[PDB]
Amino acid sequence: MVNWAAVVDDFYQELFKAHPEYQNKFGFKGVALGSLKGNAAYKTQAGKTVDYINAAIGGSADAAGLASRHKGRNVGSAEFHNAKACLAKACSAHGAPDLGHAIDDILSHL
Ligand code: HEM
Numbered sequence: 001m002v003n004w005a006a007v008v009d010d011f012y013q014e015l016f017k018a019h020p021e022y023q024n025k026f027g028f029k030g031v032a033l034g035s036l037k038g039n040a041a042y043k044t045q046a047g048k049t050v051d052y053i054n055a056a057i058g059g060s061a062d063a064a065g066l067a068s069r070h071k072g073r074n075v076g077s078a079e080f081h082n083a084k085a086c087l088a089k090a091c092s093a094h095g096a097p098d099l100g101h102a103i104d105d106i107l108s109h110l
Contacts (some may be wrong), residue, residue: 014086067109
């Protein structure tokens with residue numbers, strides 16, 4: 001099975017390396033990037049992201065709901081376009097299918 005947990009870890013590394021300030025919105029604010037894997041708040045968040053990916057592939061993802069929750073944290077289209085790029089890099093690094101269509105689905109509600 002595609003190692004989505006590893007893809008997601010690389011995704012967050014790319015995302016926070018390019019936009020360190022995005023990390024301030026999470027429960028692992030301030031934590032060194034090389035230590036995220038040892039952080040409980042991060043472990044939970046990464047698990048939810050992996051779940052969302054498996055839901056998008058499986059056909060049950062609620063893109064509208066995910067978009068609305070992100071708007072609820074003041075996260076919008078710009079951030080998601082940046083995330084789309086970071087996730088494409090993470091997928092490519094693992095020879096995983098690209099998730100651009102799934103991100104476009106979320107973007108369609110932002
Ligand atoms: C690849 C794109 C992204 C995906 C698939 C994704 C997925 C998720 C999921 C599944 C959750 C949990 C949702 C829930 O509350 O039920 C979440 C929460 C959150 N996301 Fe995203 N996200 C993405 C990009 C971003 C970006 C770019 C930001 C910018 C800061 C962000 C900020 C947040 C924040 C602040 C939370 C709430 C965390 C908390 O409750 O402590 N996300 N995300």
